[PDB]
Design a protein around this motif. Structure first.
Motif, PDB file in Angstrom:
ATOM      1  N   UNK B  17       0.079  -3.437  -8.521  1.00 21.64           N
ATOM      2  CA  UNK B  17       1.357  -3.324  -9.204  1.00 21.64           C
ATOM      3  C   UNK B  17       2.177  -4.592  -9.012  1.00 21.64           C
ATOM      4  N   UNK B  18       3.404  -4.591  -9.529  1.00 24.30           N
ATOM      5  CA  UNK B  18       4.271  -5.758  -9.418  1.00 24.30           C
ATOM      6  C   UNK B  18       5.611  -5.521 -10.093  1.00 24.30           C
ATOM      7  N   UNK B  19       6.634  -5.266  -9.276  1.00 23.96           N
ATOM      8  CA  UNK B  19       7.969  -5.041  -9.797  1.00 23.96           C
ATOM      9  C   UNK B  19       8.994  -5.943  -9.121  1.00 23.96           C
ATOM     10  N   UNK B  20      10.218  -5.870  -9.624  1.00 25.96           N
ATOM     11  CA  UNK B  20      11.329  -6.643  -9.082  1.00 25.96           C
ATOM     12  C   UNK B  20      12.651  -5.952  -9.394  1.00 25.96           C
ATOM     13  N   UNK B  21      13.148  -5.190  -8.427  1.00 27.22           N
ATOM     14  CA  UNK B  21      14.394  -4.472  -8.609  1.00 27.22           C
ATOM     15  C   UNK B  21      14.173  -3.076  -9.152  1.00 27.22           C
ATOM     16  N   UNK B  22      13.742  -2.995 -10.407  1.00 28.21           N
ATOM     17  CA  UNK B  22      13.487  -1.710 -11.049  1.00 28.21           C
ATOM     18  C   UNK B  22      12.771  -1.886 -12.386  1.00 28.21           C
ATOM     19  N   UNK B  24       9.526  -2.589 -12.623  1.00 29.77           N
ATOM     20  CA  UNK B  24       8.200  -2.009 -12.395  1.00 29.77           C
ATOM     21  C   UNK B  24       7.166  -2.414 -13.439  1.00 29.77           C
TER      22      UNK B  24
ATOM     23  N   UNK D 105      13.993 -10.460  -3.382  1.00 33.99           N
ATOM     24  CA  UNK D 105      13.318  -9.197  -3.457  1.00 33.99           C
ATOM     25  C   UNK D 105      12.024  -9.405  -4.182  1.00 33.99           C
ATOM     26  N   UNK D 106      10.944  -8.755  -3.707  1.00 31.55           N
ATOM     27  CA  UNK D 106       9.669  -8.849  -4.358  1.00 31.55           C
ATOM     28  C   UNK D 106       9.027  -7.489  -4.263  1.00 31.55           C
ATOM     29  N   UNK D 107       7.996  -7.219  -5.085  1.00 30.95           N
ATOM     30  CA  UNK D 107       7.249  -6.013  -4.901  1.00 30.95           C
ATOM     31  C   UNK D 107       5.900  -6.477  -4.451  1.00 30.95           C
ATOM     32  N   UNK D 108       5.419  -5.994  -3.287  1.00 32.52           N
ATOM     33  CA  UNK D 108       4.162  -6.508  -2.822  1.00 32.52           C
ATOM     34  C   UNK D 108       3.067  -5.531  -3.080  1.00 32.52           C
ATOM     35  N   UNK D 109       2.133  -5.907  -3.972  1.00 33.50           N
ATOM     36  CA  UNK D 109       1.014  -5.056  -4.239  1.00 33.50           C
ATOM     37  C   UNK D 109      -0.217  -5.838  -3.919  1.00 33.50           C
ATOM     38  N   UNK D 143       1.048  -1.500  -0.796  1.00 35.05           N
ATOM     39  CA  UNK D 143       1.705  -1.530  -2.074  1.00 35.05           C
ATOM     40  C   UNK D 143       3.141  -1.160  -1.827  1.00 35.05           C
ATOM     41  N   UNK D 144       4.070  -2.102  -2.098  1.00 34.35           N
ATOM     42  CA  UNK D 144       5.472  -1.880  -1.876  1.00 34.35           C
ATOM     43  C   UNK D 144       6.195  -2.266  -3.124  1.00 34.35           C
ATOM     44  N   UNK D 145       7.438  -1.763  -3.268  1.00 34.70           N
ATOM     45  CA  UNK D 145       8.244  -2.094  -4.403  1.00 34.70           C
ATOM     46  C   UNK D 145       9.647  -2.278  -3.919  1.00 34.70           C
ATOM     47  N   UNK D 146      10.387  -3.195  -4.576  1.00 42.32           N
ATOM     48  CA  UNK D 146      11.767  -3.442  -4.265  1.00 42.32           C
ATOM     49  C   UNK D 146      11.956  -3.756  -2.810  1.00 42.32           C
TER      50      UNK D 146
END
Lengths: 274, 82, 274, 274, 274, 274
Positions: B17-22, B24, D105-109, D143-146
């Motif tokens: 996956x890959x998001x930033x803030x919301x 998604x 901020x990053x989402x780590x997958x 897998x992380x988000x925000x």
């Protein structure tokens, strides 16, 4: 052969019994204690005399019990209070049993009603203005006669209900109670020993310092929840009360009480060095 | 369009996956090739186009020849294959 | 003969039963507690009366239980809440059962929603500006009525949720919680004894030195992770809080708490030699 | 009769079952939890109901379990996550089941990727310049988000990953970790008790002498390997860290830590005689 | 019926199985974990389901295991890494299974090579001039990538290899190692307790006297062998090392270490009376 | 049926097996570990599956082991090193298996040779003039490469061989060894506890008196045999050695060592009263 239980209609205890190899009808004996059903030539094996566990099912049937007889099959259906027995034969073999502190004197009859409502009702009775916390407890059933509302209130509290604190005009009643909070906690705990535990009340004497001075700190530790300023506090029913003769009484879980005692004694000691 | 036009869809699956803030976004991979996709992007072998994303799943819509023998869209959501 | 369980449709509890040697249909008894299914001339062996373990499967069926009867085969399918029974016969022998701290008053109804969302919702409610850490917990279900959001928040925290700290304008809520972190840790531990362990909270009195002076060191040891400067810290939910009456409260794992206590007391002692 | 397991295609869990004396086909019941396969007139002996141990085989099949039924043969194939069942009959008797500290901020997958790569990726992210030792660990999946990369990093470290030390421009991350080094060591040890052991961290207070003075000696003992000059050292993950308030923190095996403590205290004592 | 194991060709694991009373061919199931062989109408007695113990035979076959099935004969041939199965039928009844401290960065790949050679190779690499003792150990297999030779060396030492001492231009590496010498000694000892024992390392502080003065005596006691003058000494890997901060570190068997400590402390005491 | 073992030719391990009721020939499986022999329709009773104990027989056959198979007779003949199998049928029923401190660098290869000879050979090598006592030990086998004779000598000593003392021009090597003398003594002792005992070495510090003065007395007590004047002495390998730093080291049986210590300390004490 086999026995079964089920509820229908309006809080009725039905007992569906499986009779394989029967023609006529058994002997129904409605007693004031339990029921009796004999089936000649219907001797059932001990591997089918299993009993039921319909406890606290809100029905007239306490619990069904099956027992193998010499050559017949006896049935024991424990009951309670006034009730009526009704046998039904939907077919040649299937049997069924439908088992269907100073105030004015008041009589308090509350049947399965929320304590909160009882709280309001009393207030409406011109008995103070009682305001509970939000989620104090649940519903309770009491029936009293010839008792002042204030007295009944105390009795009500003991039953399972809450303790009361009065501001003066308005009274706040909270779930600060030994039994409910802990009882539930006990069940929650996996460990058997945990099943035994307790919220307890203890009185702390304050020799050296004034009780009120402690209030700020005690309020803070007590709030192991967010709360800008509450005398009553979270942490599931911990409470600190200040008696006139400068002693503090704390009611709560042992862990919380321990913490509070340590702080109180701790502050008291430096006051002590005079 | 992009290199992805050298890979099939059988080899394209949800790998991360890959998001930033919301926002998604969903991260897919084809035969090793890693390529992400977010609300309104490109994927698949022929002409893939994603519309929305979701927890442990993404809602896309490609374009492959079929039902006639000529390129034709086709929506479909994928369930995170971990 | 044999029993089986499976889910289908939308959170439905299906109970596929294997009936080898049956013609007609058994006696289906839908009760408010469980289900009953008798099969005349279908007496099954005790080696096939195995029970199911579909616990926490998010279905109306609590758990399937098979029991051999005298000459028939009784079935017990425990259920919960309101539900409906649906029997299906795909063939003469195969049976199936489709079991299908001061704020405005608010009623909080959150059904299976992330705590984080509930956190946001409350903030949107004009209840402060609440900002959680990143991975605080998970989702929770609560339903309350007639409770101020601040109070509900405390109740929410207790349920499984986090504790709250307020900066003043913005509030940070973190997973600093006894139960979740440790509970999971317990399960993680292979040793049974380890299953019993605890994150605990303790209050450290600081007689000699000011609490703030400790902050630099405590922050450092607390960061057993990379972090340039964080009051809250990693090490899986360790936290240090500074009360006004110059005492430090630490909430975390015993090991971490021990370390923190040693340092605090250690610094305090030299302050002590006056 | 007998059961068997094997992997094929692409991470698929195949369950080859031997059915001797069967004609038609069994009843395949694909459930969200496990699988069910009944074979009428195929009752297998308890001496053939052996179960499989395909744990951590990187397949959708948790583990195969065979159980003898009353008159048939029930099969239990536990599964996990989303999957699909595929039965194959290569012949009349052989059955098969193909189960297929402040940053942006990053989402780590990261799915099954080396920690080292994750380390690089973060650095590429403009998150510092992170350089690991050589053989820090292995691969991990998170897998992380925000979450800010710095925070995610800490979380990453805890998962199984390393601890981080920062030079300032460049950061070195090493396998100095309680769990991996020792866990492997435990397994290595023949003795069961040895299975329980630990690398631990301890803080050494240095009252009398400056921490830096110790560095030369500590570095030397720490190098129970060849190394001209390394702050981090071998001996499989022993590390000494110097905090600002002149205390030393050592993380490593108990034996190594003991040695280090003895020396530190030893030097401190002569400093002590003032 | 019976099972057998043997090696042939080039490190191949052959499994000769005796099938008496069979005509056709069994079901060969080559799995990624083990092998499966079912023989219909070949049910073997539990007195012939003996397993093999071909452990550390340098073959793809971990170990052969025979198990009696309901009516057939199942076979379990555990394997490892990539391999290929080959069945051979030399006759109608006989079955067979042919299972076939700062340096330049370097990647060290040594497959089953003597440590001594690895020592030389590194030196050739311009990594110092490393000279071992004569009979340091044996052969070892390591594969590393992206690691400086100095670092790899330390890792190499830990694997089973030796410790290193550097003269400066030339480095001597010796079998002074906890594990090998003692491990072998343990096996040698008949007593089970003896199996647990240890060569250990200890640090001796020398307050009163200079470390070098001890050298003559320590060298002498250390030589419980003939040796005109050797810093390293016999007695199977006992060593004394002198650190800069005038402490002695001794690595060796407990008995030898005890002797050395007694002498060191003994000399130190008279120095002590000042 | 029955098994038998015997040696013939030149260190060959013959395994004569008695096959009563056999016609054809069994299945000979020559493995790198052991041997396998199956005899169809030759199932032997567990009362004839006795094993052999030909241990240390100086043969390629480690030990013969007989085991009864399901319907046949399996044979296990453990072997070692390179060997060849040869079956012989002297008759229809009788089976047989013929299993057929600074010196120059030197490589020492001695195969089953007396230590005394190895001692001489080394001396001939220009390695000192080594003269042993008379009956030092026995024969030993070592094979070394690239080792100086002095080093090899030490290694040789450890193997089972003696310790060395050097006069300077000539060196005397004696059986003063922990293992041999005591090991044999242990076996000699009837008591099991006696089997555990030890010759040990201890160092005696001599503070007050000169070591040499003791020599006369120590020599005398040491000679619990006739001997006009011998530094080395009888009493089966007791020895006293005088180190330069005036300490005495004694190597011998505990009883003898005890005696020597008592005398040494005893003399030292009167020297002590100064």
């Amino acid at each position: 052969t086999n026995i079964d239980f089920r509820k229908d209609g309006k809080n009725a205890g039905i007992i569906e019994l499986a009779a394989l190899g029967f023609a006529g009808q058994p002997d129904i004996s409605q007693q004031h204690d339990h029921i009796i059903v004999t089936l000649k030539n219907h001797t059932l094996p001990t591997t089918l005399q299993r009993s039921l566990d319909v406890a606290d099912f809100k029905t007239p049937v306490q619990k069904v019990t099956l027992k193998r007889l010499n050559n017949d099959t006896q049935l024991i259906i424990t009951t309670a209070g006034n009730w009526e027995l009704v046998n039904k034969s939907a077919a040649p073999g299937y049997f069924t049993f439908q088992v269907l502190f100073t105030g004015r004197k008041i009589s308090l009859d509350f049947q399965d009603v929320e304590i909160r409502t009882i709280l309001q009702i009393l207030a409406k009775e011109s008995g103070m203005n009682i305001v509970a916390s939000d989620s104090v407890n649940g519903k309770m059933t009491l029936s009293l006669k010839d008792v002042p509302w204030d007295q009944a209130l105390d009795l009500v509290m003991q039953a399972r209900n809450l303790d009361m604190r009065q501001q003066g005009n308005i009274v706040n009643i909270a779930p600060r109670d030994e039994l409910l909070a802990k009882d539930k906690a006990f069940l929650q705990a996996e460990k058997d020993i945990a099943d035994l535990g307790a919220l307890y009340s203890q009185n702390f004497q304050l020799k050296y310092k004034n009780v009120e001075e402690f209030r700020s700190i005690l309020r803070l530790d007590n709030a192991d929840t967010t709360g800008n300023r509450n005398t009553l506090i979270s942490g599931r029913g911990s409470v600190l009360i200040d008696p006139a003769t400068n002693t503090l009484i704390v009611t709560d879980t042992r862990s919380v009480i321990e913490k509070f005692r340590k702080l109180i004694d701790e502050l008291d000691v430096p006051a002590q060095q005079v | 369009k992009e290199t992805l036009e050298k890979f099939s869809l059988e080899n394209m699956r949800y790998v991360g996956i890959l998001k930033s803030g919301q926002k998604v976004s969903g991260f897919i991979e084809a035969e090793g090739y890693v390529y992400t996709v977010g609300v309104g992007n490109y994927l698949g072998q022929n002409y893939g186009r994603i519309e929305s994303i979701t927890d442990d799943s993404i809602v896309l819509n490609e374009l492959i020849e079929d039902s006639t023998g000529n390129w034709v869209s086709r929506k479909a959501e994928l369930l995170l294959n971990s």
